[PDB]
Scaffold this active site. Structure first.
Site, PDB file in Angstrom:
ATOM      1  N   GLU A  35       0.823  -1.157  -0.129  1.00 47.82           N
ATOM      2  CA  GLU A  35       0.075  -0.057   0.062  1.00 47.82           C
ATOM      3  C   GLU A  35       0.747   1.155  -0.015  1.00 47.82           C
ATOM      4  O   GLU A  35       0.488   2.276  -0.582  1.00 47.82           O
ATOM      5  CB  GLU A  35      -1.083   0.066   1.330  1.00 47.82           C
ATOM      6  CG  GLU A  35      -1.963  -1.257   1.451  1.00 47.82           C
ATOM      7  CD  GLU A  35      -3.076  -0.794   0.158  1.00 47.82           C
ATOM      8  OE1 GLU A  35      -3.148   0.327  -0.498  1.00 47.82           O
ATOM      9  OE2 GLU A  35      -4.058  -1.606   0.081  1.00 47.82           O
ATOM     10  N   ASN A  46      -8.050   8.869  -5.037  1.00 52.03           N
ATOM     11  CA  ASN A  46      -9.017   7.871  -6.130  1.00 52.03           C
ATOM     12  C   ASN A  46      -9.508   8.676  -6.867  1.00 52.03           C
ATOM     13  O   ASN A  46      -9.893   9.791  -6.736  1.00 52.03           O
ATOM     14  CB  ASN A  46      -9.748   7.084  -4.811  1.00 52.03           C
ATOM     15  CG  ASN A  46      -8.882   6.385  -3.881  1.00 52.03           C
ATOM     16  OD1 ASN A  46      -8.103   5.955  -4.020  1.00 52.03           O
ATOM     17  ND2 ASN A  46      -9.338   6.457  -2.743  1.00 52.03           N
ATOM     18  N   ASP A  48     -12.855   8.413  -7.607  1.00 48.70           N
ATOM     19  CA  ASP A  48     -14.071   9.012  -6.946  1.00 48.70           C
ATOM     20  C   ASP A  48     -13.949  10.364  -6.215  1.00 48.70           C
ATOM     21  O   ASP A  48     -14.805  11.080  -5.689  1.00 48.70           O
ATOM     22  CB  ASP A  48     -14.787   8.094  -6.084  1.00 48.70           C
ATOM     23  CG  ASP A  48     -14.221   7.570  -4.898  1.00 48.70           C
ATOM     24  OD1 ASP A  48     -12.948   8.238  -4.365  1.00 48.70           O
ATOM     25  OD2 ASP A  48     -14.931   6.862  -4.229  1.00 48.70           O
ATOM     26  N   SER A  50     -12.120  10.395  -3.627  1.00 47.59           N
ATOM     27  CA  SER A  50     -11.801  10.353  -2.019  1.00 47.59           C
ATOM     28  C   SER A  50      -9.960  10.305  -1.913  1.00 47.59           C
ATOM     29  O   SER A  50      -9.628  10.223  -3.097  1.00 47.59           O
ATOM     30  CB  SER A  50     -12.080   8.840  -1.367  1.00 47.59           C
ATOM     31  OG  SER A  50     -11.834   7.967  -2.372  1.00 47.59           O
ATOM     32  N   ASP A  52      -6.643   8.226  -0.152  1.00 47.12           N
ATOM     33  CA  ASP A  52      -6.065   6.971   0.806  1.00 47.12           C
ATOM     34  C   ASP A  52      -4.798   7.743   1.635  1.00 47.12           C
ATOM     35  O   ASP A  52      -3.824   8.494   0.949  1.00 47.12           O
ATOM     36  CB  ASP A  52      -5.720   5.914  -0.035  1.00 47.12           C
ATOM     37  CG  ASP A  52      -6.876   5.326  -0.562  1.00 47.12           C
ATOM     38  OD1 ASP A  52      -7.911   5.156  -0.584  1.00 47.12           O
ATOM     39  OD2 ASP A  52      -6.344   4.157  -1.230  1.00 47.12           O
ATOM     40  N   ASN A  59      -8.830   4.946   3.477  1.00 48.28           N
ATOM     41  CA  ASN A  59      -9.760   5.757   2.630  1.00 48.28           C
ATOM     42  C   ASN A  59     -10.717   6.834   2.995  1.00 48.28           C
ATOM     43  O   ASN A  59     -11.434   6.303   4.217  1.00 48.28           O
ATOM     44  CB  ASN A  59     -10.280   4.849   1.566  1.00 48.28           C
ATOM     45  CG  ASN A  59     -10.781   5.485   0.516  1.00 48.28           C
ATOM     46  OD1 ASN A  59     -11.038   6.717   0.312  1.00 48.28           O
ATOM     47  ND2 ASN A  59     -11.603   4.738  -0.373  1.00 48.28           N
ATOM     48  N   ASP A 101     -14.975  -5.015   9.903  1.00 43.75           N
ATOM     49  CA  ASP A 101     -16.184  -4.414   9.174  1.00 43.75           C
ATOM     50  C   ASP A 101     -16.926  -5.304   8.648  1.00 43.75           C
ATOM     51  O   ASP A 101     -18.027  -5.297   8.228  1.00 43.75           O
ATOM     52  CB  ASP A 101     -15.624  -3.232   8.279  1.00 43.75           C
ATOM     53  CG  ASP A 101     -16.947  -2.544   7.540  1.00 43.75           C
ATOM     54  OD1 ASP A 101     -17.931  -2.103   8.263  1.00 43.75           O
ATOM     55  OD2 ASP A 101     -16.696  -2.226   6.639  1.00 43.75           O
TER      56      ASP A 101
END
Ligand SMILES: [Cl-]
Ligand SMILES: [Cl-]
Ligand code: NA
Length: 129
Positions: A35, A46, A48, A50, A52, A59, A101
């Site tokens: 990562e 990203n 969209d 957003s 990270d 994110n 999650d």
């Protein structure tokens, strides 16, 4: 801070990540390597809109607030900048919530495509733990 491999392995263990939700320490180290290349200051936008953040590229869509991701949540209750610290406590705490999650480590793209199923113990080989 750019951590060394065995250094991050030790910091992750000291912060309780080793075998957290069943994931051995080499899965965490491997996910960090792909990562962020072990760099706590890594940031990547990203499509969209957003972003990270950090050693585990958490994110802003769901987990931290950066002020510029419309419609998102901040489920770790933290400014995304806290995730870029030399001290990994906030990244680790927030990763524990993410991994709990429901989808395990598959939340990390790079872990599913580059770590899952491989010989992840190699990531902690030779380290004093
Ligand atoms: Cl926002
Ligand atoms: Cl799982
Ligand atoms: Na957010």
């Amino acid at each position: 801070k750019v951590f060394g491999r065995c250094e991050l392995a030790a910091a992750m263990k000291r912060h309780g990540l080793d075998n957290y939700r069943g994931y051995s320490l080499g899965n965490w180290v491997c996910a960090a390597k792909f990562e962020s290349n072990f760099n706590t200051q890594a940031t990547n936008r990203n499509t969209d809109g957003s972003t990270d953040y950090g050693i585990l590229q958490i994110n802003s869509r769901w987990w931290c607030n950066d002020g510029r991701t419309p419609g998102s949540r901040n489920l770790c209750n933290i400014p995304c900048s806290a995730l870029l610290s030399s001290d990994i406590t906030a990244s680790v705490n927030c990763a524990k919530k993410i991994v709990s999650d429901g989808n395990g480590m598959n939340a990390w793209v790079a872990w599913r495509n580059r770590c899952k199923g491989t010989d992840v113990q190699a990531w902690i080989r030779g380290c004093r733990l």
